[PDB]
Ligand binder design. Structure first.
Ligand SMILES: Clc1ccccc1Nc1ncc(-c2ccccc2)n2cncc12
Length: 271
């Protein structure tokens, strides 16, 4: 729909940018208020840094994927500077939260709880025929009540025929990304499942880099031999075995997100 009919368009006046949370090559993220009272995140596009069609694509996808476990689109401003306004996540990114005094004190039970919440989010994404492609603790946000939500949908895609194929040039974080996606550019929900296994390591290590002490080429070498990541310090063995299922060689042997959610809730209500 055009901007004058689009239920998501808001007048820029409705928004007050209060505290900057982040700044990079392509714009900023702010905490601010919508209509004086409602706390919001505002991502702003730095003009000329990238296409506004490309920037707005993330908001259009979020219009289609609404769930409690996914950071919610609130509104767009489609005149420069372009804004995407969402649900505010008070405790910021999981990777950062896990390192704070409150993150430090969390028991394994609460960690397993948060893991289940993330799987539940991904189970919705899976049911809807989408993939995420950027699933990692940096892209999970944490609420004031310590609930978790999937964020950063920039690489997220509605799947045609189960597989998205990126361009020959395209590069992805080696430690988080499934071998078939690094090697062939082919992504499926099963690529995300692989990423989830890596994300579980970040949870149990409070946000440490996967494959401690290893370079990208070493990770690749080890994986091809049939090794997987060494058992993180203090990782319960049941969780580690659940990671290994996410890292099955054949994407099709990897579990569903519904399965992963189910098992993690069992782990949680047992601890
Ligand atoms: Cl603003 C936006 C646009 C597109 C997709 C998700 C979000 N939501 C958020 N992104 C980033 C942060 C954020 C950015 C920097 C540091 C910590 C959190 N955030 C906090 N609450 C909601 C969001």
């Amino acid at each position: 729909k055009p901007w004058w009919e689009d239920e998501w368009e808001v007048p820029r006046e409705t928004l007050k940018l209060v505290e900057r949370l982040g700044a990079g090559q392509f714009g900023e993220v702010w905490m601010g208020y919508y209509n004086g009272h409602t706390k919001v995140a505002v991502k702003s596009l730095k003009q000329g840094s990238m296409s506004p069609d490309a920037f707005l694509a993330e908001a259009n996808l979020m219009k289609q994927l609404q769930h409690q476990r996914l950071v919610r689109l609130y509104a767009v401003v489609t005149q420069e500077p372009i804004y995407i306004i969402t649900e505010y996540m008070e405790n910021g990114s999981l990777v950062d939260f896990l390192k704070t005094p409150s993150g430090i004190k969390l028991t394994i039970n609460k960690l397993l709880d948060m893991a289940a919440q993330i799987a539940e989010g991904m189970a919705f994404i899976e049911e809807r025929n989408y993939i995420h492609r950027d699933l990692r603790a940096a892209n999970i946000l944490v609420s004031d009540t310590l609930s978790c939500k999937i964020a950063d949908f920039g690489l997220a895609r509605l799947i045609e025929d189960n597989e998205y194929t990126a361009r020959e040039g395209a590069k992805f974080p080696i430690k988080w990304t499934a071998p078939e996606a690094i090697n062939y550019g082919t992504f499926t929900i099963k690529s995300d499942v692989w990423s989830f296994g890596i994300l579980l390591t970040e949870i149990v290590t409070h946000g440490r880099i996967p494959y401690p002490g290893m370079t990208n080429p070493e990770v690749i070498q080890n994986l091809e031999r049939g090794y997987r990541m060494v058992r993180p310090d203090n990782c319960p063995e049941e969780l580690y075995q659940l990671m290994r299922l996410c890292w099955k060689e054949r994407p099709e042997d990897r579990p569903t997100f519904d399965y992963l959610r189910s098992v993690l809730e069992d782990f949680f209500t047992a601890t």
